[PDB]
Design an enzyme around this catalytic site. Structure first.
Site, mmCIF file in Angstrom:
data_model
loop_
_atom_site.group_PDB
_atom_site.id
_atom_site.type_symbol
_atom_site.label_atom_id
_atom_site.label_comp_id
_atom_site.label_asym_id
_atom_site.label_seq_id
_atom_site.Cartn_x
_atom_site.Cartn_y
_atom_site.Cartn_z
ATOM 1 C CG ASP A 170 -5.416 -0.394 -0.338
ATOM 2 O OD1 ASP A 170 -6.271 -0.698 -1.168
ATOM 3 O OD2 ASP A 170 -5.537 -0.595 0.881
ATOM 4 C CG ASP A 177 -1.744 -1.130 1.532
ATOM 5 O OD1 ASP A 177 -1.349 -2.239 1.206
ATOM 6 O OD2 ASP A 177 -2.808 -0.977 2.153
ATOM 7 N NE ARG A 227 -9.058 -5.662 6.763
ATOM 8 C CZ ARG A 227 -8.168 -4.688 6.606
ATOM 9 N NH1 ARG A 227 -8.586 -3.433 6.408
ATOM 10 N NH2 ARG A 227 -6.882 -4.957 6.696
ATOM 11 C CG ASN A 276 -9.369 -2.591 0.663
ATOM 12 O OD1 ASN A 276 -8.136 -2.615 0.593
ATOM 13 N ND2 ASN A 276 -10.009 -2.130 1.707
ATOM 14 C CG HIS A 277 -8.597 2.097 0.241
ATOM 15 N ND1 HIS A 277 -9.304 3.155 0.780
ATOM 16 C CD2 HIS A 277 -8.402 1.209 1.251
ATOM 17 C CE1 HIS A 277 -9.491 2.929 2.072
ATOM 18 N NE2 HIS A 277 -8.960 1.752 2.376
#
Ligand SMILES: [Mn+2]
Ligand SMILES: [Mn+2]
Length: 315
Positions: free
Chosen positions: A96, A67, A225, A128-129
Protein backbone atom coordinates in the site's frame (compact mmCIF):
# COMPACT_ATOMS: atom_id res chain seq x y z
CA UNK A 1 15.35 19.62 -18.11
CA UNK A 2 17.61 20.41 -15.19
CA UNK A 3 16.46 17.60 -12.85
CA UNK A 4 17.81 14.24 -11.47
CA UNK A 5 19.49 11.94 -14.05
CA UNK A 6 20.78 8.38 -13.72
CA UNK A 7 24.65 7.92 -13.67
CA UNK A 8 25.74 5.59 -16.45
CA UNK A 9 22.04 4.57 -16.64
CA UNK A 10 21.95 3.41 -13.01
CA UNK A 11 20.63 4.67 -9.61
CA UNK A 12 23.27 5.92 -7.20
CA UNK A 13 23.06 7.48 -3.78
CA UNK A 14 23.50 11.03 -5.08
CA UNK A 15 20.69 10.54 -7.62
CA UNK A 16 18.40 9.36 -4.77
CA UNK A 17 19.26 12.42 -2.68
CA UNK A 18 18.62 14.70 -5.65
CA UNK A 19 15.36 12.91 -6.46
CA UNK A 20 14.06 13.29 -2.90
CA UNK A 21 14.82 17.07 -2.91
CA UNK A 22 13.25 17.50 -6.44
CA UNK A 23 10.04 15.74 -5.25
CA UNK A 24 9.99 17.64 -2.00
CA UNK A 25 9.86 20.81 -4.14
CA UNK A 26 7.03 19.25 -6.19
CA UNK A 27 8.94 18.74 -9.44
CA UNK A 28 8.60 15.80 -11.83
CA UNK A 29 11.21 13.19 -12.74
CA UNK A 30 11.69 13.12 -16.53
CA UNK A 31 9.67 10.28 -18.10
CA UNK A 32 12.80 8.68 -19.59
CA UNK A 33 14.35 8.35 -16.14
CA UNK A 34 11.03 7.09 -14.62
CA UNK A 35 10.90 4.58 -17.47
CA UNK A 36 14.50 3.47 -16.77
CA UNK A 37 13.75 2.80 -13.07
CA UNK A 38 10.54 0.90 -13.86
CA UNK A 39 12.14 -1.46 -16.43
CA UNK A 40 15.21 -2.06 -14.19
CA UNK A 41 13.14 -2.77 -11.05
CA UNK A 42 10.85 -5.12 -12.99
CA UNK A 43 13.96 -7.12 -13.84
CA UNK A 44 15.18 -7.16 -10.17
CA UNK A 45 11.68 -8.08 -8.78
CA UNK A 46 10.94 -10.72 -11.44
CA UNK A 47 13.91 -12.69 -10.14
CA UNK A 48 12.72 -12.96 -6.53
CA UNK A 49 10.75 -15.78 -4.84
CA UNK A 50 7.24 -15.00 -3.96
CA UNK A 51 8.47 -15.57 -0.39
CA UNK A 52 11.63 -13.52 0.35
CA UNK A 53 13.76 -15.29 3.00
CA UNK A 54 16.11 -13.02 4.88
CA UNK A 55 18.70 -13.83 7.58
CA UNK A 56 19.45 -11.21 10.17
CA UNK A 57 22.83 -11.86 11.88
CA UNK A 58 23.08 -10.92 15.54
CA UNK A 59 24.39 -7.33 15.33
CA UNK A 60 22.07 -6.52 12.35
CA UNK A 61 18.72 -4.71 12.56
CA UNK A 62 15.91 -4.02 10.13
CA UNK A 63 13.06 -1.54 10.00
CA UNK A 64 9.51 -2.64 9.02
CA UNK A 65 7.06 -0.04 7.74
CA UNK A 66 3.36 -0.51 6.88
CA UNK A 67 1.07 1.39 4.53
CA UNK A 68 2.35 4.72 3.25
CA UNK A 69 -0.46 5.57 0.73
CA UNK A 70 1.18 8.36 -1.31
CA UNK A 71 2.15 10.37 1.84
CA UNK A 72 5.49 11.34 0.47
CA UNK A 73 6.29 14.03 3.06
CA UNK A 74 5.70 11.47 5.82
CA UNK A 75 7.94 8.98 3.95
CA UNK A 76 10.67 11.63 3.99
CA UNK A 77 10.02 12.09 7.74
CA UNK A 78 10.63 8.29 8.29
CA UNK A 79 14.03 8.55 6.64
CA UNK A 80 14.79 11.65 8.74
CA UNK A 81 13.83 9.90 12.00
CA UNK A 82 15.27 6.57 11.27
CA UNK A 83 18.08 7.25 8.72
CA UNK A 84 18.30 6.67 4.99
CA UNK A 85 18.24 3.07 3.66
CA UNK A 86 21.69 1.55 3.38
CA UNK A 87 23.38 -1.87 3.73
CA UNK A 88 23.51 -1.27 7.43
CA UNK A 89 20.04 0.26 7.73
CA UNK A 90 17.71 -2.19 5.81
CA UNK A 91 13.99 -1.52 5.31
CA UNK A 92 10.88 -3.53 4.55
CA UNK A 93 7.92 -1.62 3.27
CA UNK A 94 4.79 -3.75 3.70
CA UNK A 95 2.47 -2.79 0.73
CA UNK A 96 0.00 0.00 0.00
CA UNK A 97 2.60 2.53 -1.20
CA UNK A 98 0.13 4.26 -3.47
CA UNK A 99 -3.58 5.42 -3.65
CA UNK A 100 -5.45 7.93 -1.40
CA UNK A 101 -2.39 10.20 -0.84
CA UNK A 102 -1.73 12.64 -3.65
CA UNK A 103 2.03 12.10 -3.82
CA UNK A 104 1.82 8.41 -4.82
CA UNK A 105 4.10 8.83 -7.83
CA UNK A 106 6.74 10.47 -5.60
CA UNK A 107 6.44 7.68 -2.99
CA UNK A 108 6.64 4.79 -5.49
CA UNK A 109 9.58 6.05 -7.63
CA UNK A 110 11.58 6.88 -4.44
CA UNK A 111 10.95 3.33 -3.14
CA UNK A 112 11.77 1.72 -6.46
CA UNK A 113 14.91 3.95 -6.56
CA UNK A 114 16.10 2.58 -3.24
CA UNK A 115 15.17 -1.03 -4.20
CA UNK A 116 17.56 -0.60 -7.22
CA UNK A 117 20.27 0.98 -5.07
CA UNK A 118 20.11 -1.59 -2.22
CA UNK A 119 18.48 -4.81 -3.65
CA UNK A 120 19.48 -7.03 -0.73
CA UNK A 121 18.71 -4.45 1.97
CA UNK A 122 15.57 -2.69 0.78
CA UNK A 123 12.45 -4.86 0.48
CA UNK A 124 9.03 -4.09 -0.95
CA UNK A 125 6.01 -6.42 -0.49
CA UNK A 126 2.82 -6.16 -2.46
CA UNK A 127 -0.28 -4.74 -0.81
CA UNK A 128 -3.90 -4.84 -2.06
CA UNK A 129 -3.50 -1.29 -3.48
CA UNK A 130 -0.70 -2.40 -5.87
CA UNK A 131 -3.46 -3.81 -8.12
CA UNK A 132 -5.38 -2.40 -11.12
CA UNK A 133 -8.86 -2.50 -9.57
CA UNK A 134 -7.80 -0.44 -6.62
CA UNK A 135 -5.58 1.94 -8.65
CA UNK A 136 -8.40 2.80 -11.02
CA UNK A 137 -10.68 3.93 -8.14
CA UNK A 138 -8.39 5.29 -5.41
CA UNK A 139 -6.16 7.78 -7.16
CA UNK A 140 -2.91 6.16 -8.43
CA UNK A 141 -4.00 5.56 -12.06
CA UNK A 142 -5.46 9.10 -12.12
CA UNK A 143 -2.26 10.48 -10.77
CA UNK A 144 0.03 8.65 -13.27
CA UNK A 145 -2.20 9.60 -16.24
CA UNK A 146 -2.01 13.23 -15.05
CA UNK A 147 1.77 13.34 -14.58
CA UNK A 148 2.76 10.93 -17.37
CA UNK A 149 0.51 8.86 -19.61
CA UNK A 150 -1.69 5.78 -19.70
CA UNK A 151 1.36 3.95 -21.07
CA UNK A 152 3.48 4.80 -17.99
CA UNK A 153 0.50 3.52 -15.87
CA UNK A 154 0.45 0.17 -17.65
CA UNK A 155 4.17 -0.17 -16.99
CA UNK A 156 3.62 0.45 -13.17
CA UNK A 157 0.84 -2.19 -13.23
CA UNK A 158 3.20 -4.80 -14.71
CA UNK A 159 6.02 -3.97 -12.27
CA UNK A 160 3.52 -4.30 -9.24
CA UNK A 161 2.74 -7.87 -10.51
CA UNK A 162 6.29 -8.88 -9.68
CA UNK A 163 6.37 -7.61 -6.03
CA UNK A 164 6.95 -10.55 -3.63
CA UNK A 165 3.90 -11.37 -1.40
CA UNK A 166 5.65 -12.16 1.96
CA UNK A 167 8.92 -12.06 3.78
CA UNK A 168 10.37 -14.35 6.40
CA UNK A 169 13.15 -13.23 8.79
CA UNK A 170 15.28 -16.01 10.36
CA UNK A 171 12.50 -18.63 9.83
CA UNK A 172 10.74 -16.87 12.77
CA UNK A 173 8.81 -13.75 11.69
CA UNK A 174 6.49 -13.74 8.68
CA UNK A 175 5.54 -10.40 7.20
CA UNK A 176 2.73 -9.85 4.62
CA UNK A 177 0.40 -6.93 3.90
CA UNK A 178 -3.02 -8.33 4.78
CA UNK A 179 -2.72 -11.59 6.78
CA UNK A 180 -3.33 -15.32 7.06
CA UNK A 181 -5.57 -17.68 5.21
CA UNK A 182 -9.19 -18.61 4.65
CA UNK A 183 -8.28 -22.40 4.83
CA UNK A 184 -6.07 -24.27 7.30
CA UNK A 185 -2.77 -26.01 6.49
CA UNK A 186 -1.10 -23.39 4.25
CA UNK A 187 2.70 -23.70 4.51
CA UNK A 188 5.71 -21.42 3.75
CA UNK A 189 6.31 -23.79 0.80
CA UNK A 190 2.82 -23.11 -0.57
CA UNK A 191 3.54 -19.32 -0.43
CA UNK A 192 6.91 -19.81 -2.18
CA UNK A 193 4.98 -21.63 -5.03
CA UNK A 194 2.33 -19.00 -5.69
CA UNK A 195 2.61 -17.75 -9.31
CA UNK A 196 2.23 -14.19 -8.31
CA UNK A 197 2.69 -12.25 -11.59
CA UNK A 198 -0.96 -11.41 -12.08
CA UNK A 199 -3.84 -9.44 -10.73
CA UNK A 200 -4.86 -11.40 -7.60
CA UNK A 201 -7.79 -13.83 -7.85
CA UNK A 202 -11.11 -13.35 -5.96
CA UNK A 203 -10.17 -16.06 -3.50
CA UNK A 204 -7.28 -18.24 -2.41
CA UNK A 205 -3.87 -17.76 -0.69
CA UNK A 206 -2.74 -14.90 -2.93
CA UNK A 207 -5.97 -13.04 -2.25
CA UNK A 208 -5.78 -13.74 1.51
CA UNK A 209 -2.14 -12.48 1.85
CA UNK A 210 -3.22 -9.08 0.41
CA UNK A 211 -6.65 -8.73 1.87
CA UNK A 212 -7.37 -10.62 5.14
CA UNK A 213 -7.76 -9.10 8.75
CA UNK A 214 -7.32 -10.65 12.29
CA UNK A 215 -10.41 -10.71 14.56
CA UNK A 216 -10.36 -11.13 18.33
CA UNK A 217 -12.67 -14.15 18.50
CA UNK A 218 -11.79 -17.72 17.56
CA UNK A 219 -12.80 -19.04 14.07
CA UNK A 220 -13.07 -17.21 10.70
CA UNK A 221 -15.62 -14.72 9.51
CA UNK A 222 -16.64 -13.42 6.17
CA UNK A 223 -14.65 -10.19 5.58
CA UNK A 224 -16.43 -6.80 5.83
CA UNK A 225 -14.24 -5.86 2.85
CA UNK A 226 -16.10 -8.37 0.63
CA UNK A 227 -13.01 -10.44 -0.19
CA UNK A 228 -10.98 -12.95 1.88
CA UNK A 229 -11.84 -13.34 5.61
CA UNK A 230 -11.19 -12.33 9.20
CA UNK A 231 -9.08 -14.92 11.14
CA UNK A 232 -9.08 -15.50 14.93
CA UNK A 233 -6.23 -16.27 17.33
CA UNK A 234 -6.73 -20.01 16.87
CA UNK A 235 -5.98 -19.68 13.12
CA UNK A 236 -2.79 -17.73 13.89
CA UNK A 237 -1.63 -20.20 16.48
CA UNK A 238 -2.13 -23.24 14.21
CA UNK A 239 -0.31 -21.50 11.31
CA UNK A 240 2.67 -20.44 13.48
CA UNK A 241 2.90 -23.99 14.97
CA UNK A 242 2.87 -25.80 11.62
CA UNK A 243 5.41 -23.42 10.09
CA UNK A 244 7.64 -23.16 13.19
CA UNK A 245 7.24 -19.39 13.34
CA UNK A 246 7.14 -16.96 16.32
CA UNK A 247 4.67 -14.31 15.11
CA UNK A 248 3.48 -12.37 12.10
CA UNK A 249 3.66 -8.72 11.17
CA UNK A 250 1.04 -7.32 8.80
CA UNK A 251 -0.30 -3.89 7.92
CA UNK A 252 -3.51 -3.04 5.93
CA UNK A 253 -5.60 -1.44 8.76
CA UNK A 254 -5.26 2.14 10.07
CA UNK A 255 -4.45 2.13 13.80
CA UNK A 256 -4.92 5.21 16.17
CA UNK A 257 -1.52 4.59 17.79
CA UNK A 258 0.22 3.37 14.54
CA UNK A 259 0.38 -0.27 15.68
CA UNK A 260 -1.58 -3.04 17.41
CA UNK A 261 -0.49 -6.36 18.86
CA UNK A 262 -3.37 -8.89 18.61
CA UNK A 263 -3.79 -12.66 19.27
CA UNK A 264 -1.79 -12.43 22.53
CA UNK A 265 1.41 -11.34 20.82
CA UNK A 266 1.10 -13.38 17.62
CA UNK A 267 -0.39 -10.92 15.15
CA UNK A 268 1.21 -7.46 15.05
CA UNK A 269 -0.17 -4.58 12.87
CA UNK A 270 2.14 -1.73 11.80
CA UNK A 271 0.77 1.23 9.90
CA UNK A 272 3.11 3.96 8.58
CA UNK A 273 0.74 6.75 7.29
CA UNK A 274 0.23 9.32 10.09
CA UNK A 275 -3.00 11.52 10.01
CA UNK A 276 -4.17 9.27 7.26
CA UNK A 277 -5.90 11.07 4.36
CA UNK A 278 -5.43 14.34 6.29
CA UNK A 279 -8.41 13.40 8.52
CA UNK A 280 -7.74 10.42 10.77
CA UNK A 281 -5.58 12.08 13.36
CA UNK A 282 -3.73 8.80 13.92
CA UNK A 283 -0.11 8.31 14.85
CA UNK A 284 2.03 6.06 12.62
CA UNK A 285 4.87 3.69 13.56
CA UNK A 286 7.56 1.55 12.26
CA UNK A 287 9.15 -1.48 13.87
CA UNK A 288 12.77 -2.29 14.70
CA UNK A 289 13.80 -5.92 14.79
CA UNK A 290 17.33 -7.18 15.53
CA UNK A 291 19.07 -10.41 14.81
CA UNK A 292 19.83 -11.16 18.49
CA UNK A 293 16.26 -10.39 19.53
CA UNK A 294 13.42 -10.54 17.09
CA UNK A 295 10.76 -9.12 19.39
CA UNK A 296 9.17 -5.93 17.79
CA UNK A 297 10.20 -2.50 19.09
CA UNK A 298 7.69 0.17 18.12
CA UNK A 299 8.63 3.70 17.09
CA UNK A 300 5.80 6.19 16.83
CA UNK A 301 5.68 9.41 14.77
CA UNK A 302 3.11 11.99 13.69
CA UNK A 303 2.29 13.84 10.45
CA UNK A 304 4.47 16.65 8.90
CA UNK A 305 3.28 19.52 6.67
CA UNK A 306 2.92 18.84 2.92
CA UNK A 307 1.83 21.06 0.02
CA UNK A 308 -1.84 21.93 -0.26
CA UNK A 309 -2.94 19.15 -2.55
CA UNK A 310 -5.90 17.16 -1.23
CA UNK A 311 -6.17 13.37 -0.76
CA UNK A 312 -7.63 11.76 -3.82
CA UNK A 313 -7.37 14.87 -5.90
CA UNK A 314 -6.61 12.37 -8.69
CA UNK A 315 -9.37 9.80 -8.12
MN1 LIG B 1 -3.81 0.46 3.08
MN1 LIG C 1 -4.27 -2.82 2.40
Amino acid sequence: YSGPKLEDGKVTISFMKELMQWYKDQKKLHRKCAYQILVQVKEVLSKLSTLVETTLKETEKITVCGDTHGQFYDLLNIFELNGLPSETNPYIFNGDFVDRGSFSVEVILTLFGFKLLYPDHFHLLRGNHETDNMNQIYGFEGEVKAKYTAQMYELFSEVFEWLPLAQCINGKVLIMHGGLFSEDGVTLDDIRKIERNRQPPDSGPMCDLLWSDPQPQNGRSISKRGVSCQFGPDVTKAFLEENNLDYIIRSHEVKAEGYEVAHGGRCVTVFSAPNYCDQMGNKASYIHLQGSDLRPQFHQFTAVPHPNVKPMAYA
